[PDB]
């Protein structure tokens, strides 16, 4: 059951560097690439993310794509950079310019064939292929355009597998780019048709995690990318270690998605506490569950208290009793019964894995399907309609070649997604 990773754009390559450091550490892979672990439990599932090259070494099954090589030169220069296969770095000669149309139509089609050739070689090398995993930002230029182009091509070539995405979306308070609404709208339009499950993260939520929970005085992007690498490596943990109740990406999907369009999820990771306070409180299942449902620990700006949970999933790592997990999930469902949609008799799936992340006795990652995600799309649609009525900056997109009809289609599709979430939020048995 092998995963293929795709890393797109500056944000994707930067998050990927820390993710592959965390995964190489958990399986005891030296930064030179040599296996140096001390138990067979580490080696027996290394195939899931690594391919085996001769004489002990392992190489990671990932494709890195970007339009300017600056970030890739930074990751190759990083402390674990040597592990990556040189042939897996694909680059052009000019930037995306923050324009979706350039990334999708003009500079995209020149490289996309070489990217598909590498992705096909990696997929066809596996004895049994599991879904693809992609991390990219929707606000950028090459991330949005080339990521959605590649997603469309892989969905044409492998329609029976799973497509999972981790995506960065613009904060509600401060923009980093003026033309963010166009890139976000077209990317969400592409994802809702092509993707099977998509997770969304706001940088503002990671800043609030760092300042409020960890009390860091001057956080940096390295901290945000470590929190993201921790949760992303946590969701897949049951695929590659033994446990009392195994789980798989398809099993999470079957329990989380009631209808095929409702595949947008919230994320959380529980054991966060400042270095001064940590000596005063031991880890236990009630503490993890209490932090798990606190909106302070959720990595998106929308808050659950304005919505209702359709479904949620919790993956626990560590040696622990099943009774405490089951009774905690029952107690949270019974005490807050008004916040769970009533026509589903049980909304939470649990899973238990024996091996925790290094340095923690226990950990849990939380995935939530909540209707409050509709508020971000509504905000993006309002800003898009304000910009579109005056056709702001439109000549860039039309000069690259886009028809105006794509903008009206993407707006209509997001409006229907918001409407569908709002109608299921207010549904009743009658």
């Amino acid at each position: 059951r092998e995963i293929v990773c795709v890393q797109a754009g500056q944000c994707g390559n930067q998050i990927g560097s820390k993710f592959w450091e965390v995964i190489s550490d958990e399986h005891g892979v030296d930064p030179t690439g040599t296996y140096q672990g001390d138990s067979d439990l580490q080696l027996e599932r290394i195939n899931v993310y690594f391919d085996e090259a001769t004489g002990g070494r392992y190489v990671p099954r990932s494709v890195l794509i970007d339009l300017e090589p600056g970030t890739m030169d930074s990751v190759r220069a990083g402390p674990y950079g040597q592990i990556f296969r040189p042939d897996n770095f694909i680059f052009g000669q000019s930037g995306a310019g923050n324009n979706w149309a350039k990334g999708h139509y003009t500079e995209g089609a020149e490289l996309i064939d070489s990217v598909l050739d590498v992705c096909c070689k990696e997929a066809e090398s596996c004895d049994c292929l599991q879904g693809f995993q992609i991390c990219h930002s929707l606000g950028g230029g090459t991330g949005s355009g080339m990521g959605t182009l590649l997603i469309s091509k892989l969905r044409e070539q492998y329609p029976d597998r799973i497509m999972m995405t981790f995506s960065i979306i613009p904060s509600p308070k401060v923009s980093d780019t003026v033309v963010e609404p166009y890139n976000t709208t077209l990317s969400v339009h592409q994802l809702v048709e092509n993707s099977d499950e998509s997770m969304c993260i706001d940088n503002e939520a990671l800043y609030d995690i760092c300042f409020r929970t960890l009390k860091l005085t001057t956080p940096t992007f390295g901290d945000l990318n470590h929190l993201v690498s921790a949760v992303v490596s946590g969701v897949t943990c049951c695929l590659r270690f033994p446990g009392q109740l195994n789980s798989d990406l398809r099993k999470l999907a079957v329990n989380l998605v009631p209808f095929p369009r409702l595949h947008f999820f919230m994320m959380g990771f529980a054991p966060l506490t400042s270095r001064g306070s940590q000596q005063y409180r031991g880890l236990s299942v009630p503490e993890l569950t209490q932090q798990m449902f606190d909106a302070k620990n959720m990595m998106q700006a929308a808050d659950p208290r304005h919505g209702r949970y359709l479904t949620a999933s919790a993956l626990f790592r560590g040696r622990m009793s099943t009774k405490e997990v089951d009774e905690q999930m029952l107690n949270v469902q019974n005490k807050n019964s008004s916040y769970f949609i009533e026509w589903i008799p049980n909304n939470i799936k649990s899973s238990v894995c024996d091996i925790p992340p290094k340095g923690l006795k226990m950990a849990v990652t939380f995935i939530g399907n909540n209707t409050c995600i509709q508020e971000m799309f509504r905000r993006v649609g309002e800003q898009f309609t304000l910009m579109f009525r005056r056709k702001a900056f439109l000549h860039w997109y039309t000069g690259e070649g886009m028809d105006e009809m794509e903008f009206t289609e993407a707006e209509s599709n997001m409006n229907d997604l918001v409407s569908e979430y709002q109608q299921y939020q207010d549904a009743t048995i009658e």
Partner: protein
């Protein structure tokens, strides 16, 4: 990666001397083109490539042309201290000036010299593998800068096509003045510049004099001071291509974020830590203080007040020791302010860039040494006031044909005055229509 700079006329060459002095001192190229070896680090770096190319012997030569019709200023560059740095073909000089006549530069005299300039620019563009734009420095008040700059921009626009052209232009100051015919030349220049420029940066000498009297303590400034400030601004904007940083900004990103419609491309510029060495050690210079500074009109390098208009886009470049969280907190505080207003169709008004290299200190300079700086270029409807006052002065002289016989004798039809005046009238109405808010329903 690479960028070519074109300097035209007297102001453009003198500003070029300050710019290349700064680029040499920041990269470390000696005045004779050499670059001393480093013994602490094993190998050298590619950062010069944006502005310098190396010969097989390791000498550096710069990616620039200097164009003038009078020989004297270029001969001063040829006989000065940086004589060995420039390639002699790059310094192109004619025999006699355009005598403050746009017509003499454009029709009579520049037509002979323009083909040599195009051959040199072609020879530079052939020695590149990732050219990403032209930077142009000229003054629109003089004859050769306006006429030859327009003719050359037209020829470049036909030959190279989509390649970007970013201009730094010295316009006639609103009450300080140097020549009588400045309005005619500035109007006729602006007519050509409307069709053939992607972003235009506006400068006024009266603003830089105000900035050097108020913040620095200089009672009798001269053009070298203004040119050193301009060089610092250009170095801040181009640093994003040359040094490591958290959020880089390519020259195409400026055009994508700042220009909403193809004619609305004139932008205001300002710079924050203009401070003297004696004042700098009594005060902290935090991110929020310099961010608050860039929005006061006392910080601007163009004489216009942005409180009489609406912002459409802002691009903020931070260089030095800055952390993204402080930039976000500062921008959110600025957004809270009630005296800063954006057009209602531009909700996401900001672009940010963060670079780690702090600004360099020049041996004879007057700025203090500081750990961080921010520079802003912004598009605002307030710029319409500059054109309206130039157009009114043009109308005053043209009502009596005050000097037209010179222009008609040197080759221009009288109709060209009326055409240009109607084009500037349409540009004024464009700034009136784009700035109208439809926030009220019904």
């Amino acid at each position: 990666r690479e960028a070519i700079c074109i300097h035209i006329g007297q102001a453009g060459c003198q500003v070029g001397n300050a710019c290349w002095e700064l680029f040499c001192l920041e990269h470390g190229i000696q005045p004779d083109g050499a670059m001393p070896s480093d013994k602490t680090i094993g190998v050298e770096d590619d950062a010069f490539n944006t502005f310098f190319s190396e010969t097989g012997a390791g000498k550096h030569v710069p990616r620039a042309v200097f164009l003038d019709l009078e020989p004297t200023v270029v001969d001063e560059v040829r006989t000065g201290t940086y004589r060995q740095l420039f390639h002699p073909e790059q310094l192109i000089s004619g025999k006699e000036d355009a005598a403050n006549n746009y017509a003499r530069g454009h029709y009579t005299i520049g037509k002979e010299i323009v083909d040599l300039c195009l051959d040199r620019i072609r020879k530079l563009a052939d020695n590149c593998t990732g050219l990403q734009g032209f930077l142009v420095y000229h003054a629109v008040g003089g004859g050769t800068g306006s006429g030859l700059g327009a003719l050359l921009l037209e020829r470049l626009s036909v030959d190279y096509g989509k390649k970007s052209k970013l201009g730094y232009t010295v316009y006639p100051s609103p009450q300080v003045s140097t020549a009588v015919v400045e309005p005619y030349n500035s109007v006729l220049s602006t007519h050509s510049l409307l069709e053939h420029t992607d972003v235009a940066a506006m400068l006024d000498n009266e603003a830089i004099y105000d900035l050097t009297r108020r913040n620095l303590d200089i009672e009798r400034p001269t053009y070298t001071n203004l040119n050193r400030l301009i060089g610092q601004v250009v170095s801040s904007l181009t640093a994003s291509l040359r040094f490591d940083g958290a959020l880089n900004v390519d020259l195409t990103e400026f055009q994508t974020n700042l220009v909403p419609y193809p004619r609305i491309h004139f932008v205001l510029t300002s710079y924050a830590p203009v401070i003297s060495a004696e004042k700098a050690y009594h005060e902290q210079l935090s991110v929020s203080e310099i961010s608050n500074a860039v929005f006061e009109p006392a910080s601007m390098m163009t004489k216009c007040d942005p409180r009489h208009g609406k912002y459409m886009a802002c691009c903020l470049m931070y260089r030095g020791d800055v952390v993204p969280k402080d930039v976000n907190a500062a921008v959110a505080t600025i957004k809270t302010k009630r005296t800063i207003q954006f057009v209602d169709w531009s909700p996401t008004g900001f672009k940010c860039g963060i670079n780690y290299q702090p600004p360099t200190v020049v041996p004879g300079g007057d700025l203090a040494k500081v750990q961080r700086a921010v520079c802003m270029i912004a598009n605002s409807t307030a710029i319409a006031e500059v054109f309206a006052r130039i157009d009114h002065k043009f109308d005053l002289m043209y009502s009596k044909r005050a000097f037209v016989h010179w222009y008609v004798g040197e080759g221009m039809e009288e109709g060209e005055f009326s055409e240009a005046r109607e084009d500037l009238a349409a540009l004024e109405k464009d700034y009136e229509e784009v700035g109208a808010e439809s926030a009220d329903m019904d």
